[model samples]
Target: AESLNVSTSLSPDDPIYKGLQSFKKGVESRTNGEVKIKLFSQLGADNELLQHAQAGSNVGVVVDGARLAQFVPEFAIIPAPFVFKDYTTLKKFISSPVFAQWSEQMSSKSGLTPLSFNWYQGARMLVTQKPVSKPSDLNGVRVRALEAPVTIETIKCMGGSPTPLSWSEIYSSIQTGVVDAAEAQPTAVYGSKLYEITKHITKTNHIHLMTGIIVSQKWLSSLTAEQQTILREEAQKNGDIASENTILAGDKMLDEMAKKGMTISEVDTQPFIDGCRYVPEKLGLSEAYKQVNSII
Candidate 1:
C-alpha cells in the first residue's frame, strides 16, 4: 500500500479542493484502499511542497505549467500568451499526443509526473484603478506579474511595465499604489480580496489559466503498476470535474466582484493578442509555441 498527500494553497471553498476530494475517493475505491490519498490546504508556500515532492516524499501539488517549464522548456509553451482561445479549443490541445510527450518529459527531466493538466482557473484579467480598453492603455501601467519568464514577458508584450512580485505582496502593493494594476482570474481576484480595492476588471483574457496535479516521480515509481494506473486515471477524471466547476463558478465570481466595487467589462483583446505573439520568441520558445499552434 502507498499514500499520496496532495497539498494546495487554495481554500476548501475553492472548486479545486472539491476536485481533490473526488480524486481521493476515486483512488481509494479503485485501488481497494491499497492507495491512500490525503488532502491539505493553505499549507503556505507551494514551492516548499514541490521541493518535497522532488525529494520523493509521496507528495503532490497543484501547479501551473510555467512553473514546470523550469524543467522542460516546452511546458512553458502551455501557458504562453494568447496560445489557447477558450475551454473548448483548450481541452483538445491538452489531451493530444503532443501533451502526452510534454507530460512524460516532465517526469523524465524534472522528476515530476503530472497526472492531469486540466484544472481550469479561468482567464487572467486586468484589475486597474481605471478602465482598460486597449493594449496602448497599459503604456505606463505597472502590472504585478508572477516571477516567471512567460508571465513577465507576457505583461511586457501586452504593453504593461511588468513588475515581478509575489502573490502575497499583490493586495498590499495594489492598495498602496506600488503597482498600477494586477492581472488575475476572477476567482483569484475575489479569493485574494483584490476586488475590495480594484476599480476595473477588464477581460483581456490573455492567458487561459489551467494547472496540473504534479506528483513526485520517484514516489510514483514506488507504487505498484496497478496503483499507478488507477492514480493516473482517477486524477484526470477528477480534473474534468475541476474544470467544469471553475467554469460554472467563473461568471458567479464576476458578478460577485462587480457587486463589491469592481466595474467588470469586456474589452477588445485583438491588439493585446497580436502584441503578445512576441512573448514565446522572447522566452526562446518560438518552436514550442509553433508546435502548440499547429496542434490547436
Candidate 2:
C-alpha cells in the first residue's frame, strides 16, 4: 500500500480543503485500500514542502505557478498580473498543450509534477484599511504580498510597498501595523477571518489564483500506471468542485464580511491594469504572454 501525504497552506475551513477530502475519499474507495492518502494543513512553509517533494519523500504541497516558476520560469506567467481574462480562459489554458510541455519540463528538471491545475480560487482583490479608488491611493501604505516575484512587482507597480510574509502571518501583521492591507480572494478573507481586521476590500481583480496539487515526480512514478491515472483523475475532478465552491461563495462571503464591518468596493481598474502592463515583459514572459493570449 502507498500513503501520500500532502500539505496545504490553506486553513482547514477553506473550501478547497472540502474538495481535498473528496479527493482522498474517492481515491481510497476506488483503489480499495491500495493507495491511502492523508491531508495536512500548515504543516510547514510552502518552500519547505516543495523541497521535501523534490527530494522524493512522498510529501507534496498545494502550490501556485509562481512558486513552481523557480524550477521552470515559464510557470510564473500563470500567476502573472492580469494574465487570464476569466476563469474559463484560464482553465482552458491550464488544460492546453502549452501547459503540458511545461509540466514535462517540470517533471524531469524540478522533480515535481502537478496532479491537476483545475484548482481555481477567485480573483484576488485588495483588503485595506481605507478606500482605494486608484493606484495613487496605495502610496505610503504597506500591503501584505505573497511570496512570488510577480507578487512583489504587482504591488510595487500599483504604488504600495509589498511586504512579503507567510499566509499565517498576514492577519496579525496587518493588525500590528506591519502591513496596512492585504490582497486575497474573498474566500480566503472570510475563511481566515481577516474581515475582523480589514475595513475595506477593493475589487482590483489583479490576479486570479488558479493553483493545483503538485506532487513529487519520483513518488508519482513509484505508483503503477493505473494508480497514477487515478490520482490525476481524482485531483482534477475535485479541483473543479473546489473551483465552483469558490465562485458561488464569492459574493456570499463578501456580504457576510460586510456585515462584520468590511466594505467591498469597486474601483476604476484601468490605472492598476496599465501599471501592471509592464510586468510580463519585466519578467521576460513577453513571448509566453503573447502565446497564451493567442490561445485564450
Candidate 3:
C-alpha cells in the first residue's frame, strides 16, 4: 500500500477542498488502501506547492493554470477574455484533442500535468471600492495581481497599476488599501474572505480561472506502470466531479454575497477585452487568445 500526499491552496471549506476530499476517498475506497491520498490545504500558496512539486517532494498540487502561462503562453487561452461564452463550451474544448495537444505541450514545456483540467474557479472580475465598468474608470486604480507576467500585463493594459501580491495577502491588502482593487472568481473572493473588506463585485469575467492536479514527474516516474495508470485514471475521474462542484460553489458564493449586501455590477467588457490584445500579438497562438466556444 502506498500513501499519496496531495496539497492545495484552497480553504478547508472551499468546494475544491471538498473535491480533494472526495478524490482521496475514492482512491482509498477503490484501491482498498493500496493508495491512500492525504490532503493538505491552503499551504502557503500555489508557488509553494509548485516549488515542492518541482523539487520532487512527493507533494501533488491543485493549482491555477495561469501560473504556468508565464512559461508557456498558450495556457493563457483558457482564461482569455470571452473565449468561453458558457461552461458547456469551455468544458468541451478542455477535453478535446486541441487541448490534449496544448496540455501535453504545456507539460513538456512547464513540467506539470493538468489533471482535473475541467475544474475551473470561474472567470475573474474586478472587485473595487468604486464602480469600474470601463477601462477609463479604472485609471489610477491600484490593482492587486498575481506575481506573473500575464497577470501584471493584463492589469496594466486595463488602465490600472498592477501591484504584485501573494494570494495569502489579498484579504489584508484589500483591507488596508495596499491596493484599491483586486480581481478573482467568486469562489476565490469568498474562499479568502475578501468580500469582508471589498464591497463591489463586478461581473467582468476578464480572466477565466482554472485549477489542476499536478503530480511530480520524478515521483510519478518512480512508480510502477500500473501505479501510474491508476493515479492518472483516478485524477481524470475525480476531475469531472470536482469541476461540477466548483461551478456549484461559484453560484453559491455569489448568492451568499448578494445576501450579505455585497454590491454586484454588470458592465460592458469590450474595453478590457480590447486592451489585452497585446498578449495574443506578442505570443502568437501560444497565448491562447482565440475563443473555445465551439468546443465548450
Candidate 4:
C-alpha cells in the first residue's frame, strides 16, 4: 500500500464524499501501514484526470459512466433513457457476469483495469427555467450540456439547443441566460445550488448513472502480487457498500429537494426516450450499441 490519489466531482459535504471517506478508512486499515488514499474533489469538467490515470499515474477517479463510454462504448447504456425499473434491478444487472465481459473489453481498449464498476450516482432529472412537462414544451429552449458528443445529441432530440459549457461556469451561464436549463441528479441539483436559480424540475429520469473506480493496468502490474490483491480487495469491499448507500441517498435527496421550494413534476418519459434515439448514433454507436440492449 502506498499513498494513492483519487479524484471525484463531489464537494466535501456530498453523500459521495461520505462514501469516499469510509472507503479511504477501510482501505488504510485493511492494508495496515502499507496503503493510503487521498481524495481530490470537484476535479474539473473535461475529465483530464481520467487520462492521467490511464497514463499510469498512481491515480484513480470517480467519473461518469457515459464518460467511460468514450473508451468502452458498452458503459454508455447506463445513460440510455428508461433502462431500469429500480435501483435493485439495476444493481443486479450491473453486477452480473455480462458487465465483467465489458470490463475486459474496456481494459483491452483503454489500457486501464477497473477496480470496480459498481459506482452508482442517483438518476438524472431535467431542470428548466420554465414550467413544462412534455418534449414539445422544450422545443427551441437552450439547455446546457457538457462538451461531450452524446450529451449534445441527447438534448437536441429532446428539442432543445444544447450549449456546451464548463461546470465551473454553469451558475453564471444560468444567471446570464447563456443556458436556460440543465439535467442532473437531485443531489447534484441541490449540491450545486442549481435549484436556487432554476424554477422547474421535471422528473424525466433520463439516465441511470454508473461510475468506475479504476487503476492503470500498467501501474498495477508493476506492483507485487500481494500489493495487487490488497488494492483490489479493499476497493471492492468499499465499492459494495457505496453502491447500496448511493440508492438510499438518492431517495433522501428527493425528499430534501421537495422542502426547498423547487417545483417537481413527473412527465411521460417515452417521448424523451424516442426523441433521444439519435444520441447513440451521433456518438458513433449506430451499430455497436445494440449489443448492450441484447445483454439486458
What TM-score goes with each of the models? 0.91, 0.88, 0.80, 0.84
lDDT of each: 0.85, 0.87, 0.73, 0.74
What does candidate 2 score on TM?
0.88
Q: State the lDDT of candidate 2 residue by residue for 105-217, as single tens digits.
A: 99998899999988888999988888999999999999888766788999998889999888878878988888898888888788778999879999888888888999999
In candidate 3, position 197 carries an lDDT of 79
lDDT (C-alpha) at residue 96 in model 2? 92
Candidate whose lDDT is highest: 2
Q: What lDDT does model 1 reach?
A: 0.85
lDDT of candidate 1 over 1-296, digit per residue (tens): 68988877777888888999999999999888989999876544677777788789887888887778777778777777888887788888988888888888878877888988888878888889888898888999999987677778888888899888888889999888889899888888877888888799998888887788889999999888888899989888999998899878888988988888789989887888888877788889988888787888
The true-structure Cα RMSD of candidate 1 reads 2.2
Tell me model 2's lDDT, rounded to 2 decimals.
0.87
Ranking by lDDT: 2, 1, 4, 3
Candidate with the larger lDDT of 2 and 3? 2
Task: State, as a TM-score between 0 and 1, how close model 4 is to the true structure.
Answer: 0.84
Backbone clashes under 3 angstroms, per model: 0, 0, 5, 1
Pick by TM-score: 1 or 3, better one: 1
Which runs in model 2 stand beyond 4 Å of their true positions? Answer: 42-45, 146-148, 164-178
Residue pairs of candidate 4 with colliding backbone atoms: 1-34
> Which tens-of-lDDT digit does each residue in 30-122 have in candidate 3?
777877889875455667776676666577777654666665656766655556656677777777877787767766766666655766667
